[PDB]
């Protein structure tokens, strides 16, 4: 850095470091405190979070609860699972976000026992609804959306995950005003448009409009849609069939591994440098003051 900047030892000495996960720019604790903590008179009742994160085009849904030793995953679903259910493209998109949520919804809701009862909306006309408690039966499983550092904006796809997880039978308390199709100057939801996003309508129409306007770009991006021969119209039935596949068998097959833990460890340990002994460190000093010191 610059000379007149530097840092005093005095500066470094009194410096209080933030939490590691804040220094990493990952966890927002002000939100986390208020997400996690439980009514003290509910004792060991956990507070489950529906955690949604977007990598550069991969989607992550985990239902997570807290322990002072560390957090605990009840269940997890990623958008890269979607090829199993018949979605090979655009795994980062709104409709993909919906699907994954539904996947996460059915998956845990299954392994809790609430599989059969509480199926949520099977119709998906995109109406605004919460899964209601069943008269004389178990209350539904309750989960709170953890948006992380994502900005809340109306039409954001973090609320896509929310929609499918809600549509999947989970109880995720929410309002309608961040869903695509929310009107600014009147508080009203257009369900026609929200239904359109669930099925990828905004992507299909863009495919349409590039079909005849500019075919230079349509070839660049959407390239893969050509290779498998999928044009716009059929996209609604890709995601419709996806939903049914998910609801039929949510159960989460893992990858086949191939090269066990030991095996990956051996190969990776090659590329990790190792520290030295104080002996080695000392030997370098003495060597240095034989050379740099002793007049060449």
């Amino acid at each position: 850095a610059f000379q007149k900047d530097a840092k005093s030892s005095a500066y470094s000495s009194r410096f209080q470091t933030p939490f590691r996960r804040r220094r990493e720019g990952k966890t927002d604790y002000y939100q986390r405190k208020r997400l996690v903590t439980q009514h003290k008179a509910k004792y060991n009742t956990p507070k489950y979070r529906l955690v949604v994160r977007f990598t550069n085009k991969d989607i992550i849904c985990q239902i997570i609860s807290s322990t002072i030793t560390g957090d605990v995953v009840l269940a997890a679903a990623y958008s890269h699972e979607l090829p199993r259910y018949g979605i090979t493209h655009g795994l980062t998109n709104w409709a993909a976000a919906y699907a994954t949520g539904l996947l996460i919804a059915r998956r845990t809701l299954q392994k809790l026992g609430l599989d059969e009862t509480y199926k949520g909306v099977e119709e998906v006309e995109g109406e605004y609804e919460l899964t209601e408690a069943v008269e004389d039966g178990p209350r539904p499983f309750k989960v709170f959306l953890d948006i992380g550092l994502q900005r809340t904006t109306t039409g954001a796809r973090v609320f896509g995950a929310l929609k499918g997880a809600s549509d999947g039978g989970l109880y995720v308390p929410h309002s309608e005003n961040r869903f695509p199709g929310w009107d600014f100057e009147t508080e009203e939801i257009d369900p026609e448009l929200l239904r359109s996003y669930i099925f990828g309508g905004h992507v299909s129409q863009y495919m349409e409009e590039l079909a005849d306007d500019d075919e230079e770009r349509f070839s660049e991006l959407f390239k893969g849609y050509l290779a498998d021969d999928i044009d716009a119209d059929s996209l609604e039935d890709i995601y419709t069939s996806a939903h049914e596949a998910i609801r039929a068998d949510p159960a989460f097959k893992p990858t086949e591994k191939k090269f066990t833990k030991e095996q990956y460890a051996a190969e990776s340990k090659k590329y990790r440098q190792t520290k030295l002994s104080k002996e080695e460190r000392a030997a370098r000093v003495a060597a240095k003051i034989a050379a740099l010191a002793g007049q060449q």
Binding site: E24, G25, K26, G148, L149, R151
Partner: protein, 169 residues
């Protein structure tokens, strides 16, 4: 080693400091509008001076930041006025550069006495790809030393393309 790191212009920011608010300022504003294609932004005075004749919060000036191909055009268009010769100053240690011109007519822009004549501060901030690390919300980082823009590097960049001169010392 230079794969990726290039010197893009991050943004160009035009600035006109008018000694007061009212008709003169909104005219300076109209200049930046039709010149930048964007609606400019105006700045209030931070405190009161009275030998400069200004009151705190008075809307003293207007400016605009332009990015993309647009910025290169206005850069070039002003560099022509400066006759493609800058000085060894104008170049910050952090790698940006700027100049200024009286009489905005020297770049395109016909006269129109209902408007009048204004000067401009031109200021160019250079950077490379991967600057997002500093500006993004999540995992906000700082760019590594070798990646950082330096004065030496930007003078060099400025000498090569535009084929202009640095002069001085």
């Amino acid at each position: 080693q230079n794969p990726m790191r290039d010197l893009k212009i991050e943004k160009l920011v035009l600035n006109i400091s008018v000694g007061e608010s009212g008709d003169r300022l909104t005219r300076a504003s109209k200049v930046l509008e039709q010149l930048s294609g964007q609606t400019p932004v105006q700045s209030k005075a931070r405190y009161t001076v009275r030998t400069f004749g200004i009151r705190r919060n008075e809307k003293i000036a207007v400016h605009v930041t332009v990015r993309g191909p647009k910025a290169e055009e206005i850069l070039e268009r002003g560099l022509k006025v400066k006759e493609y010769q800058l000085r060894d100053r104008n170049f910050s240690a952090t790698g940006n550069f700027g100049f200024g011109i009286d009489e905005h007519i020297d770049l395109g822009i016909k006269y129109d006495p209902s408007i009048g004549i204004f000067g401009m501060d031109f200021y160019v901030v250079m950077n490379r790809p991967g600057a997002r690390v500093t500006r993004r919300k999540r995992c906000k980082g700082t760019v590594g030393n070798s990646h950082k823009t330096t004065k030496e590097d930007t003078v060099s960049w400025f000498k090569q393309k535009y084929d202009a001169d640095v002069l001085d010392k």
